[PDB]
Amino acid sequence: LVLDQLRCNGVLEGIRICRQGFPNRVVFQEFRQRYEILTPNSIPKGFMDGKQACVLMIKALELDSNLYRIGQSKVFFRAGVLAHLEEERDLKITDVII
Amino acid sequence: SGVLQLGNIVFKKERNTDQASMPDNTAAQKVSHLLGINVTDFTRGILTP
Amino acid sequence: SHKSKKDQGELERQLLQANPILEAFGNAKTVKNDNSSRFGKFIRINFDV
Amino acid sequence: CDFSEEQTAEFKEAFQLFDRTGDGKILYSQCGDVMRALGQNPTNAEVMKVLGNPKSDEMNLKTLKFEQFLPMMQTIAKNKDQGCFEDYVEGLRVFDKEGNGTVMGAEIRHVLVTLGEKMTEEEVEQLVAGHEDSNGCINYEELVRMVLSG
Numbered sequence A: 001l002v003l004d005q006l007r008c009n010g011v012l013e014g015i016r017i018c019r020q021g022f023p024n025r026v027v028f029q030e031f032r033q034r035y036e037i038l039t040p041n042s043i044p045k046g047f048m049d050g051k052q053a054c055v056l057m058i059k060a061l062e063l064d065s066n067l068y069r070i071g072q073s074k075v076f077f078r079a080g081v082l083a084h085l086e087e088e089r090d091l092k093i094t095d096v097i098i
Numbered sequence B: 001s002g003v004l005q006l007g008n009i010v011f012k013k014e015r016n017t018d019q020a021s022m023p024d025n026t027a028a029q030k031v032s033h034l035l036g037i038n039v040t041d042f043t044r045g046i047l048t049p
Numbered sequence C: 001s002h003k004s005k006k007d008q009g010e011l012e013r014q015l016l017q018a019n020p021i022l023e024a025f026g027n028a029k030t031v032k033n034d035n036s037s038r039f040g041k042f043i044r045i046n047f048d049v
Numbered sequence D: 001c002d003f004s005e006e007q008t009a010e011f012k013e014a015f016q017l018f019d020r021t022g023d024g025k026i027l028y029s030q031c032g033d034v035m036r037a038l039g040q041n042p043t044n045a046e047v048m049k050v051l052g053n054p055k056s057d058e059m060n061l062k063t064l065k066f067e068q069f070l071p072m073m074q075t076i077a078k079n080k081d082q083g084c085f086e087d088y089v090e091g092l093r094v095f096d097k098e099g100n101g102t103v104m105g106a107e108i109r110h111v112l113v114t115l116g117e118k119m120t121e122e123e124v125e126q127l128v129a130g131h132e133d134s135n136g137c138i139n140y141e142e143l144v145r146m147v148l149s150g
Ligand SMILES: [Mg+2]
Pocket: C035, C036, C037, C038
């Protein structure tokens, strides 16, 4: 009963695309306004395009090429990549609070 | 200055569907900083009212 | 809990009681369940900015 | 020396202000309190590392003299890592909901009592100089500026 309920519901098919695909998606502007404390010394103080700014932050973060894929208007991430950045962001914000 | 900066946003036509796209949002960021508003909200409202 | 000034309101408190009413009016024992829902509901809790 | 010895008279005269005997000796807790009051805003890690004692579990036991305080300040004035105002401004704005930075004072109290070093509510009640009314909003600009002025 439990096996037939999981196969028809598509639980397995829903997790495979989550691993092989990029479930996380962050906008260029939203990615910079939320992940700037990780690489502060990586973007000039002056104004710059949102796409050009995210390219420098990802390069400074030392992220693997297979863990992300820049698109036309949204930055894609694999399962477990964006979650790791959230943990590192908390440590940075925690230090700022301290 | 904000009114002057308005219009520089070179909207591009998507190859798949007919939808506006802002590949270079520098002018949008400048207009938002001048008028004193957000950039993400302005972009979402201009491209998806 | 995020308002303080108006903590514990009549709306948030009545939201928990408005469901048991609709449930007891058409829910009971069945062959494969003891408390089945004989009607489909779609609650939409609105939120401000 | 990284500090003018002629100015040590001011520090020596200031050390004799607490409600204690002041017989040339001060406990570790007293040293920390003096560093927090007069000296630049330190941190528990800095107090425990800079001529401190991580193994120490009772600060009311260790004791130091007056001359033992000048090396601590001279070292903290070179090893400290104090951030600018933009970092704190961004950290406070991260908790913003309207975008203008005028969130109710409850948010600041919660962030100061829970996140970070979890301060006491009685201590923050004296610093929170905001107005309590229908809105109760408090700005981060003037508040954080007066807090970081020192
Ligand atoms: Mg049911």
